[PDB]
């Protein structure tokens, strides 16, 4: 079975750039509802697998892919995001930055950019491309998570639904996606980009 | 050109069941921006239309849809709202529910978890099918507008996109569709019924 993972900080750690109402709601209520209902899907699936009951597998896909999307988007998020996070990556990343994007604020422009376009709920992704070997801005919706639906290696993700941030910013993204780059741990983004 | 409709009430006409901040910040913030990006996207496309530009066209179409489903959404949404509201239909309105649904309840059940079960940003719609001259129950995506890309007539719209309910019922949709039955201007469901 797959579990809700434990925050590694508290509730209040971003603030003021993200609020402790958000992250605990965000965190206790949305995550841990995906993860709850992947469970139950995943039964569902393995029952439908044992019997070769193919139209019960295939109509089983959405929540499969949206509560499980939701389970792996969140829990990547939550390691993206640090108290002592912000400022700029240093080493090979911010060099695999530069040789991609042309510069650190290029970067945070187009992946800005990527997130504040999304139509509805979404995602906005910076990913590795195994196969060319460099890094890649992608948009994601609803839950569809990252690798599953594209091959790319999520490296830092941005959650653009409106629970991520209209308690505190309401209708205007920009300043919620000016305020996330404050608290990004780009410790954790740089080991997740050395580990491929 | 399009132009953002006014309300046909006062913001906190709708209390204690929607209250008046999250009406204020949909018409004036969320609807305006519709309207508003609508007209600068019909504007670049009858320019592609006029050069027979394809291309840019097709690009086009994405934010036409967008916006231009988000305004015809909002703008019935408001009508179909009302501090006079709540109850039941009576008339022809009210037979065709229990005729095509089997009784108002039910009515109630199938778009309450119609509503419910969007994943994402959507809404739920009541609508009118002409060809076999039913009622039907719909969900369409983000802003996809119902006649534009199912053919039906829209009747009742509810709106579920985050933005519609997080200020003031938080994750929990189903209180929010539970609150909403209690502001529905049948009046206006039933005009647009008899209109077809
Ligand atoms: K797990
Ligand atoms: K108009
Ligand atoms: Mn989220
Ligand atoms: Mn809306």
Known sequence: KHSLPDLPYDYGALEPH????????????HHAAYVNNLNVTEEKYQEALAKGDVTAQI???PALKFNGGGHINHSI?????????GGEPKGEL???????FGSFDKFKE?????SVGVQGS???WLGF???????????????????????????????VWEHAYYLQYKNVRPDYLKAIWNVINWENVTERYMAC
């Open 122 to 124: 979404g995602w906005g």
């Open 110 to 114: 187009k992946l800005t950019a990527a």
């Open 77 to 85: 998020f939550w390691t993206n995001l640090s108290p002592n996070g």
């Open 94 to 100: 911010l060099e695999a930055i530069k040789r991609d």
């Open 129 to 159: 491309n195994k196969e060319r070997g460099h890094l890649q801005i992608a948009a994601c919706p609803n839950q569809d998570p990252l690798q599953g639906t594209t091959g790319l290696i999520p490296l830092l993700g941005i959650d």
């Open 59 to 61: 109509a089983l896909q």
């Open 18 to 29: 993200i609020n402790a109402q958000i992250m605990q709601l965000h965190h206790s209520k």
